[PDB]
Amino acid sequence: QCVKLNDGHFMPVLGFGTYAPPEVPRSKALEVTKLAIEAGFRHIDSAHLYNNEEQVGLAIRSKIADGSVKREDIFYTSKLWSTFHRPELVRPALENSLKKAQLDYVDLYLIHSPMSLKPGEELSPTDENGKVIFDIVDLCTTWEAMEKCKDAGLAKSIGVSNFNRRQLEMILNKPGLKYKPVCNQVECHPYFNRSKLLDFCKSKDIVLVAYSALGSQRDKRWVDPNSPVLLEDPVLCALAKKHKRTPALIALRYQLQRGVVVLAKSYNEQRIRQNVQVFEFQLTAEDMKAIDGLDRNLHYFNSDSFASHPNYPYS
Numbered sequence: 001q002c003v004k005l006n007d008g009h010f011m012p013v014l015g016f017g018t019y020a021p022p023e024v025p026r027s028k029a030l031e032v033t034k035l036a037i038e039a040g041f042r043h044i045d046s047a048h049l050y051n052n053e054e055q056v057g058l059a060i061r062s063k064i065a066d067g068s069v070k071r072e073d074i075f076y077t078s079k080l081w082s083t084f085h086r087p088e089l090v091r092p093a094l095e096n097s098l099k100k101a102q103l104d105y106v107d108l109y110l111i112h113s114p115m116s117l118k119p120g121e122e123l124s125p126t127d128e129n130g131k132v133i134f135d136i137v138d139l140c141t142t143w144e145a146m147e148k149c150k151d152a153g154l155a156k157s158i159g160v161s162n163f164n165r166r167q168l169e170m171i172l173n174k175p176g177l178k179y180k181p182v183c184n185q186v187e188c189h190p191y192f193n194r195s196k197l198l199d200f201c202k203s204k205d206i207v208l209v210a211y212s213a214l215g216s217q218r219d220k221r222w223v224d225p226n227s228p229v230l231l232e233d234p235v236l237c238a239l240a241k242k243h244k245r246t247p248a249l250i251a252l253r254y255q256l257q258r259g260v261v262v263l264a265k266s267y268n269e270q271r272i273r274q275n276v277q278v279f280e281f282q283l284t285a286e287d288m289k290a291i292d293g294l295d296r297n298l299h300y301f302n303s304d305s306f307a308s309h310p311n312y313p314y315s
């Protein structure tokens with residue numbers, strides 16, 4: 001099952017999340033991406049930041065080599081990291097990602113975040129106070145460079161991530177705009193359901209892609225351990241019991257029924273296989289209303305590191 005993007009390409013509505021924290025050996029991404037493909041995932045979400053494109057790319061190539069899939073069956077996403085927003089750095093960044101993954105093109109290239117950072121060696125250049133050293137870049141210029149990447153065939157589609165409505169509007173209203181973003185990949189789950197942003201995106205034919213749809217990996221770098229654990233929510237657990245599914249499946253299905261494309265990260269073989277069951281059942285209107293009632297403006301990613309950034313999208 002796919003949705004048609006505003007540039008004519010097609011995106012599978014369920015995607016595999018590949019990020020794992022640095023404490024996880026790099027080789028694991030190879031193993032789990034192959035498992036994901038074997039389970040039925042075709043949309044695979046990576047990024048320069050993840051330090052895994054070589055392993056994820058190898059998994060894709062391996063599954064093409066053994067005849068399981070063809071390149072055209074896979075929808076591969078990468079993302080431009082924030083130290084590469086200056087327009088002259090965009091195509092080189094994409095070319096580096098392609099080289100790592102050993103792919104001729106990405107299906108989707110995203111601006112990972114609107115929060116531009118100082119260019120250089122470090123992924124996350126930080127001051128002595130812990131905050132990231134910011135760069136002030138007109139993102140419309142970054143976008144123009146993204147458009148050139150699509151015209152060159154390096155990316156089939158281009159989009160953004162972590163943009164709010166105002167930031168999207170800035171791109172959409174850019175004079176001489178050639179390609180609208182096909183999507184906005186954002187934090188989205190029952191505790192932070194982004195309903196207003198979703199309505200806006202639908203009105204502009206921009207797909208909303210949900211990350212942390214299962215409540216995030218709760219990494220101590222960015223997430224308060226006090227934050228309620230999404231999958232422990234009693235409404236989600238009651239719905240799981242009602243449907244004889246799992247809280248994760250309820251959370252994924254919720255997104256699909258709102259017209260949101262949903263990612264799901266798992267590095268566990270059993271959970272990877274479980275997550276594809278999202279297509280096997282439905283939630284009723286009353287179920288959906290119960291889940292909508294959980295909305296509580298809880299973005300799990302919530303750190304000083306970026307809450308002070310001039311382009312921080314949340315308010």
Ligand SMILES: NC(=O)c1ccc[n+]([C@@H]2O[C@H](COP(=O)([O-])OP(=O)(O)OC[C@H]3O[C@@H](n4cnc5c(N)ncnc54)[C@H](OP(=O)(O)O)[C@@H]3O)[C@@H](O)[C@H]2O)c1
Pocket residue numbers: 016017018019020045046112113161162185186210211212213214215216217231246248249263264265266267268271272274275
């Ligand atoms: N654009 C961005 O700024 C951004 C930000 C965050 C995420 N992302 C993308 O979105 C992906 C997913 O988001 P996320 O990394 O925050 O994780 P997530 O999809 O919210 O998953 C959170 C945790 O759920 C667990 N899980 C998965 N399936 C489960 C199941 N069926 N039952 C119980 N637990 C389950 C996983 O643990 P196990 O691995 O142990 O199964 C995982 O660590 C990322 O990997 C990345 O590709 C993008």
